[PDB]
Amino acid sequence: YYTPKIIVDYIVKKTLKNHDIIKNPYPRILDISCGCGNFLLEVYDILYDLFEENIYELKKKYDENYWTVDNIHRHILNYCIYGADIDEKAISILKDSLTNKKVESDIKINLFCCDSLKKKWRYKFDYIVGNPPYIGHKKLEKKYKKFLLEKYSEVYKDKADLYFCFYKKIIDILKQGGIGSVITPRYFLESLSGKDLREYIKSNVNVQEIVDFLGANIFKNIGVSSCILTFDKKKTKETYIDVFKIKNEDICINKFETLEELLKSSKFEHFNINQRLLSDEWILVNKDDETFYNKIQEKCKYSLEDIAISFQGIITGCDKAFILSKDDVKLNLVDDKFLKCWIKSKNINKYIVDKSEYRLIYSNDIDNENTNKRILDEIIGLYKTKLENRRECKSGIRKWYELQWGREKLFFERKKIMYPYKSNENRFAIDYDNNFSSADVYSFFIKEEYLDKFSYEYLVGILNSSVYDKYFKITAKKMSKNIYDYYPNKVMKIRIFRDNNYEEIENLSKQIISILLNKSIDKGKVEKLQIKMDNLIMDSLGI
């Protein structure tokens, strides 16, 4: 959880580089989750140089006895550096580190061992920097979540993250005219959960700059995707955001001595976004992509949500109790009426699904424990303890052997389209085989009233096109290197069109499906057909 030095230096310089120490020699710089002091120790160094280089100007303008080089260390610690953290061992270490910068009478260091989200803050701050804790909805303590939902409701609801609240706290205790700079996960820029947080930021601070590392691995051995947000409360009217979006996610961050060298390089693209034009969604793309995205949005008269019914897959609550290999001998104990075909996200390709290798025991259809005791005793019951610990079993809503969220079978046992929940690219397939799946695969079918306007074959044709792959990724939620979330909260917002190319687009899609399903697959002709279809779609959308 140590922040790389190149990033820490950038964040501290972002807040302090243009501070007028002559005009205000008492800046308050705060790290609200300071830890061992990665940021605060750097703040000390930047401040010490700033005072030392202007010591004679300060001595002349103010108390000439107070402003001496020998007094800089005491002045910084008494008036300038502030830190908070729940870990007292970390605070104890940081207090010694700040004390040892000088090496008389004891100096008072403004370090607080507390919950920053609970501390009564007695004053606001000129500059706030740091790296807050990230805790999601599963890993956050439930008693603590009751407090967040009560006191941080403006940014924390439902599946929100703890670091949303730190954004609220930082914004709230930032002084008028102050600057804040933090590194957090990037997901709030796009996630459904971040909607209220994005609204809070946009309407309370001026966002100066967003550094989006997309799927690059900033923290070694940490599966998180990062961004750096810099914002102020200055009296400003232009309110444009500098956006630095990484171009190559494989870049090593230490290739340059400073992060500014990386941002100005070819490894990053830069563009500006007008904060006044931000909706509840933040479309952070360059001018070419915005033009591309807007062309499609205006041209398409329908969305998938308009024409389709979407649903999440089965959630058994314990897969090992209900999912068996189709060659497992224990399936001889299970009547075939209980057995469903089961696929994973890797089984979804463009246009068609791999033949399934697993079976789901649709245990909800087992009427009672004595009629099918063999299945319960020998297959499902091997995990009875874990099954009984599921929420709906402890409450009695669900029997110990039942699927936790078995949905409705009739939704799955029909022609439908399926796609993986996380993928590098658009993979929408037509399911012909009544496949069931877990929540790693999403499904939709077409509403009856739109069947004469849209066919499954036409839909997988355009949804798998290069145009729609780029189109979806403009606003999709970037998760990790080469992985986007394909979830209904964005997939169902995809807009679709219907025009004179409909018949030829549909016909090419049928050819691709026919080739994909034959014995000797010549994958090459599929690629040529896809190129022809992409041209038709670009012709249709005028790009």
Place this chain on the structure above:
DNA sequence: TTCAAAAAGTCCCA
């Protein structure tokens, strides 16, 4: 009653 979101992902190997 029952939906769908959530990576400080998880796990393995060369």
Place this chain on the structure above:
DNA sequence: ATGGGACTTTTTGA
């Protein structure tokens, strides 16, 4: 041992 690639469960609030 690490960094990078393949692949993705069920807990949870609403």
